[PDB]
């Protein structure tokens, strides 16, 4: 309680002491690429998005997402190192002259690749389809919900391309497909089919025929709200 300390308060009114260092993040002259990112996000919100594009705005729920990804991590495809090891082991088996065709078992893994998955859906071999929500050229997946609906294939739009990529040991995966599983996972798969179809395919539909976008803001909707209430 030394009396030498004293307060010396600063007043930051207009014409008073210099303004303190404030957060100016909403006034920064951002680089051109950052402005491109944010105004593209704003543009997609403002504009009237067609139903075939806005249907990708309705994605899978979190609880359904974690369980389907839990199923997928059991059927990740073999890595390059595992493939080399298996080929080396079977090559030694051939050198020892044993049954190379029966020493190995049929692989059980998720299917990936846009052309491969699309062909599987057309061939009715796909049991579950998971579509990345943000495929940058949207034409690559825009037809997939309609294709899966015609062919009676259960399909979901899951969050983010990278999660599907990490399942298949890639940076990116536009779409993943489950075509065969093991008997212990038949029940878990069927539950995921039921949840996905009920919430996402049997539901919406009327939503995938409706128009997205058109959201004004952030202060113009406050302007209209003030005008309407006045």
């Amino acid at each position: 309680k030394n009396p030498l300390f004293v307060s010396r308060p600063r007043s930051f009114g207009i014409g008073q002491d210099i303004q303190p260092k404030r957060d100016l993040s909403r006034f920064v002259k951002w680089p051109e690429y950052i402005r491109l990112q944010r105004r593209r996000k704003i543009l997609n919100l403002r504009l009237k998005v067609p139903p075939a594009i806005a249907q990708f705005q309705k994605t899978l729920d979190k609880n359904t997402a974690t369980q389907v990804f839990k199923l997928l991590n059991k059927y990740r495809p073999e890595t390059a190192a595992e493939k080399k090891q298996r080929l080396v082991a079977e090559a030694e088996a051939v050198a020892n002259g044993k049954s190379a065709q029966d020493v190995s078992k049929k692989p059980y893994n998720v299917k990936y690749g846009l052309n491969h998955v699309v062909a599987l859906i057309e061939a009715k071999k796909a049991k579950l389809v998971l579509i990345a929500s943000d495929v940058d050229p949207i034409e690559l997946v825009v037809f997939l919900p309609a294709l899966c609906k015609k062919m009676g294939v259960p399909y979901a739009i899951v969050k983010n391309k990278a999660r599907l990529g990490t399942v298949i040991h890639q940076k990116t995966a536009a779409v993943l497909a489950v075509t065969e599983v093991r008997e212990e996972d038949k029940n878990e798969l069927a539950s995921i089919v039921s949840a996905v179809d009920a919430n996402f395919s049997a539901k919406y539909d009327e939503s995938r025929r409706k128009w997205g976008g058109g959201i004004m803001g952030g202060k113009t909707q406050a302007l209209l709200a003030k005008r309407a209430k006045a």
Partner: protein, 244 residues
């Protein structure tokens, strides 16, 4: 058959002589302090701007955000003296030299260096002895009707700012020059626009009015607005002509 003097005035030797200019006379950039309150500055010096009939005023303000002094170049109004305090903002008083929004000043206020639009730092009533009159306000549309020195009526946003008072240096045109030499010196600091040869004193290759055995035009000197650049000579798009 030759490019005429009017056409050649697109630059080069017809540029403005800008060595001795003392800065561009502008209001403060419209900031938060001047939008919501007032900021006080000190008149440091009243200076002569070469080529300008009115004096300039160097006014030092404080940067509201940094420890530095911002010096602004104003068009001096009559009665401005060195050491005077000038207040700019919405809550500024109605005193000569203060910069206020036109919407905050009563009808009939004499103002100068008025802004055409909010934030362009001064467009109207800038020459010596000239001023703008606040005819009235329209609060619903947020506009202000003002009388310009040409007598025209103009609408400006109520947030546009204007300096209270008349631009200093009035009566500068009353004195006859008496001299080509004094007209030479006046225009020597402005541009190459003097002396002026008449078109009728030229040759046909040089001007529409040139040629002929007697110095005459031969056609009407009132010309349309759609005419070509080489044709826009004399009285362009004159509604009335002659001395009343």
């Amino acid at each position: 058959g030759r490019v005429i003097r009017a056409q050649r005035k697109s630059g080069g030797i017809f540029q403005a002589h800008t060595r001795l200019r003392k800065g561009a006379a502008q209001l403060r950039t419209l900031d938060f302090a001047e939008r919501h309150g007032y900021i006080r500055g000190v008149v440091q010096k009243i200076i002569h701007d070469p080529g300008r009939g009115a004096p300039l005023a160097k006014v030092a303000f404080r940067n509201p955000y940094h420890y530095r002094t911002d010096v602004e170049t104003f068009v001096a109004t009559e009665g401005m003296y060195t050491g005077q305090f000038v207040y700019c903002g919405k809550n500024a008083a109605l005193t000569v030299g203060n910069v206020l929004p036109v919407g905050e000043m009563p009808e009939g206020t004499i103002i100068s260096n008025v802004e055409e639009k909010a934030g362009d730092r001064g467009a109207l009533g800038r020459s010596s002895g000239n001023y703008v009159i606040i005819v009235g306000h329209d609060v619903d549309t947020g506009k202000t009707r003002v009388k310009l020195p040409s007598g025209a009526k103009k609408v400006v946003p109520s947030s546009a700012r204007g300096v209270v008072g008349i631009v200093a240096g009035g009566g500068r045109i009353d004195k006859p020059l008496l001299k080509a030499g004094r007209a030479f010196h006046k225009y020597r600091v402005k541009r190459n626009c003097w002396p002026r040869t008449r078109g009728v004193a030229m040759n046909p290759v040089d001007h529409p009015h040139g040629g002929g055995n007697h110095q005459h035009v031969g056609h009407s000197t009132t010309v349309p607005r759609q005419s070509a650049p080489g044709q826009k000579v004399g009285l362009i798009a004159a509604r009335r002509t002659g001395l009343l």
